[PDB]
Amino acid sequence: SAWSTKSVDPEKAKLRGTTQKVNRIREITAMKTVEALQISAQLTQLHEVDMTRVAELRKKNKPAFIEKHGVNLTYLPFFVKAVVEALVSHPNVNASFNAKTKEMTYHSSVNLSIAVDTPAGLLTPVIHDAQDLSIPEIAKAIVDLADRSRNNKLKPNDLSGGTFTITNIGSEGALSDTPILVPPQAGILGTGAIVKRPVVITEDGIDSIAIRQMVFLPLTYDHQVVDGADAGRFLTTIKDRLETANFEGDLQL
Amino acid sequence: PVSAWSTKSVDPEKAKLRGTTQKVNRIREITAMKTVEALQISAQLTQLHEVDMTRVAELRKKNKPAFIEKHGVNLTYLPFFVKAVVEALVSHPNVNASFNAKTKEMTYHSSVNLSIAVDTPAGLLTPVIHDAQDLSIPEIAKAIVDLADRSRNNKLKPNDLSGGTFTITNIGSEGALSDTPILVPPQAGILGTGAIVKRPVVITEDGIDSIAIRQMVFLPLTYDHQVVDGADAGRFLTTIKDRLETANFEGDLQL
């Protein structure tokens, strides 16, 4: 047959024609995501980042990174490091709003939530005090928290305290999405698929078309805490850090 | 013209509205009520994917004369999108589903009753193709022509409007690249088909990258996070994209 089998799970065919009660994980993700949108003013701003230099740095230093630090070098610790630094530099984004008292709380800790796709459903463990971590420590924290999310070895403190979230919306091919932030958080950054795209490049003041590894970074922000220009300035810092790609010293090889 | 103002997609009949207050028709009043309510009782988000429609465009160009001669309807892109989406809803029963927030139970529908958004002068109408999973591309093309005609001429039947399990809306009919369409519970998804645009893209032939002109489309999927999470939305769209990019539809046209 001409039907597509790509990303199709044959085991899900049994679901067809049935009514089944969902598990607690999914039941929580359902009542809480519906509520999140009603108690915040969410909007998603889109920026594109040229990941070609980070890709070249990753390709070059990955073998030594694996040998020294024991874990693989993916794109996620680069996104995490750039976002965590920008949350320190943009304290108005690493913040929570209280609609009753009209007070803004600017968190001194950057407790970064990481969305982890598991067979049981979406889980969002937190990297507490991520501002004190190096790229190797971030890479080991991701491996640890993702493993414990999939094998149900997460403590109650591992799921609380998050001040910002990062989610890989490009894990299943998406260019972008409008991820849902969960108050008290004021932002959630999605990392779209890193795709080769023709872009205009300027070298010595002359424009040319070149193939570059481009990513869309959609930021869902709460308009109660962050304005459009605030969201753009925060994303400009992240984009500048990633496009400059001065991370060789951060890898601690 | 005597002025530099644009006349493109301007309806001179709408000039009568300017400076007036009028009660909206029954279609508009319900669409206003339902869309406002829909967002308050669901967790909507729109995931975007791009699909290379060049092979479907080449197949359509080659087989359009024979399709119109045999089946009597024009061959548009919509039956290809409908066929790919209906097959993907069978393969992804978790998307062809409804959530009950009171009992926390998920119902996975055995029928794919595909809602089609039809723009009419009186407003938006959404007739349903019941049991679309049992239809061929020629039957789909005819059902679209029939339901669109009866929507515009107020001749829809009671069943033509109920039972929808998923919706497909042509947001590219009036030039849009993409949109964040509003899904209406009990449905869990609405796929929009953006405009098919010639865009320069990277093509990797035999391990070598090159820039080529391809007919690209954005397929925004609005999904309910109560029913579908980000990864399921991506897997569902990956199946649709793979079916459209492979473009093995020559037999499906039944010529």
Place this chain on the structure above:
Amino acid sequence: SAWSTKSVDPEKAKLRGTTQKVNRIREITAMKTVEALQISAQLTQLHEVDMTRVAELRKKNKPAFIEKHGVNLTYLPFFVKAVVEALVSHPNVNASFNAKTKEMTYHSSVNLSIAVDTPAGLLTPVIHDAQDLSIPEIAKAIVDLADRSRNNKLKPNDLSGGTFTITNIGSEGALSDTPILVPPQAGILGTGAIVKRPVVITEDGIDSIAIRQMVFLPLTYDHQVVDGADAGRFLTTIKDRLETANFEGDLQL
């Protein structure tokens, strides 16, 4: 250090670790944007417009325009002129819905709200009866309203009566966003960053890849007032006006 300094305000570092009451402007923005989403059916339709001809017209006529009219010639009066003309042609978009009486009011005035980013927060002054204005008058109104927004010299009529809004979401680098409309308004058009992108061009029936100055125009519309097709037709008129770029007479040189 390798940290990015781009768009980082060192003065905001003082906020980190504190709880402070937000100012009147920010408290009202937070109240209005959370409420706006609950009393409307918002969705954002995206179109791209080739601004290359407007860029070439601007470059060519800017010296004469500044000399005659006394004000700079930016892209904003071209966007304002195209949107205001389209709101006259599409009275269904320059409208307000009353959900209690089910009546649509089609405004005869195009009172265009302009989003102005200020250090004290977002302000949205209104250009009343913008349909009667020329591009030189529009350019002067923008300079005046933006100045008085930043220097807190806006009067009560300057902030009321808006029938549509235009916001420069590309001011801090964004390609696009899903801006929040505020009822009674039914639409808010965002102007993304004007970026040089490689696009396909058809000259004498032959396709080629060329560098053009492209912009994304996201329109947030209220589905109570405007359908997807209505939004597309309204944006098609705007796109046609901008891509044709017949503004030489409008510059009143």
